Amino acid sequence: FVNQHLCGSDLAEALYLVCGERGFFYTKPT
Amino acid sequence: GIVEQCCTSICSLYQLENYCN
Numbered sequence: 001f002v003n004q005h006l007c008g009s010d011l012a013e014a015l016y017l018v019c020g021e022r023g024f025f026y027t028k029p030t
Numbered sequence: 031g032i033v034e035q036c037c038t039s040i041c042s043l044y045q046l047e048n049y050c051n
Contacts, residue, residue, distance in 0.1 A: 001044070007037030014036070014046045023051025026032070 006014050015024035035041055
């Protein structure tokens, strides 16, 4: 639904804004 | 498929709702 497109940190963000304390693992650095 | 569906396509929080520990 939300048209939010993001990559690199932009991923770490949606992940950071999506859960937060739940924890989020971002495989592959850059 | 998190940077190929987000940088190229959109990630519905539902799809990013599966990347939490």
